[PDB]
Design a protein around this nucleic acid. Structure first.
Lengths: 125, 125, 125, 125
DNA sequence: GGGGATCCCTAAGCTCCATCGATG
DNA sequence: CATCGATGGAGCTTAGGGATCCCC
DNA sequence: GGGGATCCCTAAGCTCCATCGATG
DNA sequence: CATCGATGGAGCTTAGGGATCCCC
């Protein structure tokens, strides 16, 4: 459950990139759809699911993603997965960029590279 | 405790089409962050949640600063939700606040003016 | 949500009939199957769903009953519905005795009469 | 708080095939009632839950009375579950308790003897 | 004013501490 | 000499029904 | 002893209270 | 004169990471 330390870490990055960002409470045992972090800089709004892996690939439960997009759609933000590999930087992946396994999704060696920097996230639109 | 009013207010937002969330760890050092953030693709809210035993509620001009600083940066509207011992939640834009000096306030003068959730969503049109 | 007062009431009746009985906590918002009351006198064990009505009929959601029997089966007790009508006494109904509506169950004027007294409950086996 | 150990223990019971429940309102006047009651069609438990910072745990002979009075009346076995600051839950039958006078206790003498949940279910055979 | 929806105040718990005893 | 404001603290458990307050 | 799974102690919040001021 | 026991109190918020303790 070290996930927290990385959520807190990313928040700084976002805040440094101009994003008013927050961590979602009651996230785990929740009465509703809830991602890890939510952010907005006045032009862009982000629903985010945060993940840290020693190494690829990263798998994302069918459900998990449904919940993120379900939320992202409702709130009016862009659903994103932030991935953290030890030596590398925070990488940002739109749910469009995810690959379907049998009953789930993934980001592997073939996808990680075409992920976004935090700076690309802010000024793309 | 007052945690049944806390989550009571969330329901109201959701009810009104809003996708709201409780900010993780906002009983924290004066950090630009509301207690709740909500949005519905059109209107976005930054909500300082106050539960006072009676009027007036005073609000250090500092406390207010943060709500506005954040609200601006995030791209949302700044609000104070306030519940009184037998009255139901009631929404106040920062504008609607009455001033003094080191603080602002909300007493009998403005309280009946305070909006209700739905009327808040209705502003956009 | 007056249901509580009647749960507390029934507990006395049970305790008076020789049943060590208790109310189930986290019953509503629960992580698992949970009835209103559980009791045992050393010979009999009861999973119970408590209901108070001004008047018949009493309807019981398909789900609700599944949950009670699911629990009753697991714990090793007999699933029961206790019904309270104003002027009358506590009536006890085994889930076998319930009648199926379209997508639910019920106890009406045709069933209430063949319900059990608390004393019949203890010494039937 | 210590409510994450509370519900932590429930999971253990469930894990072990037990259908357990938290007694509603057992921070109540010395009322014959455990903090938890569980059962699995064969074995039934009446569990006083103690979370002590260190040994020994003392237990007024009164407090014990109630567990046994209840246990008897309900048709279950009397147990004290006890968690220590870095040790995992550990089950003690009333029998296994060490006595003094107005109290009983649990210190180094008996603690390593205390059972584990599964071994508790295993007794029946 | 009478009738009803909303509280809050009362009694209790446990865990940890610290006095105080008695016994060795 | 009181009232509205402000300033610096301390308490932070649950849970039920009798009592309150509101509103019609 | 070194390496890892488990805590607890630190800094902070809010709400309510009560002092204290100043202004009328 | 200390240790194990007992007796009568008071505090009861969260939450994160640095520090601890255990175990191999």
């Amino acid at each position: 459950s070290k996930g927290t330390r990385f959520e807190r870490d990313l928040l700084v990055e976002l805040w440094k990139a101009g994003f008013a960002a927050i961590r979602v409470a009651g996230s785990g045992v929740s009465p509703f759809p809830c991602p890890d972090i939510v952010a907005g800089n006045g032009r862009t709004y982000l629903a985010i699911e945060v993940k840290m892996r020693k190494e690829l690939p990263l798998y994302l439960s069918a459900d998990e993603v449904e919940q993120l997009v379900t939320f992202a759609r409702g709130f009016g933000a862009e659903a994103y997965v932030a991935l953290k590999l030890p030596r590398k930087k925070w990488r940002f992946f739109p749910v469009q960029m995810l690959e379907r396994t049998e009953k789930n999704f993934k980001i592997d060696e073939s996808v990680y590279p075409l992920g976004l920097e935090i700076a690309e996230v802010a000024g793309k639109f």
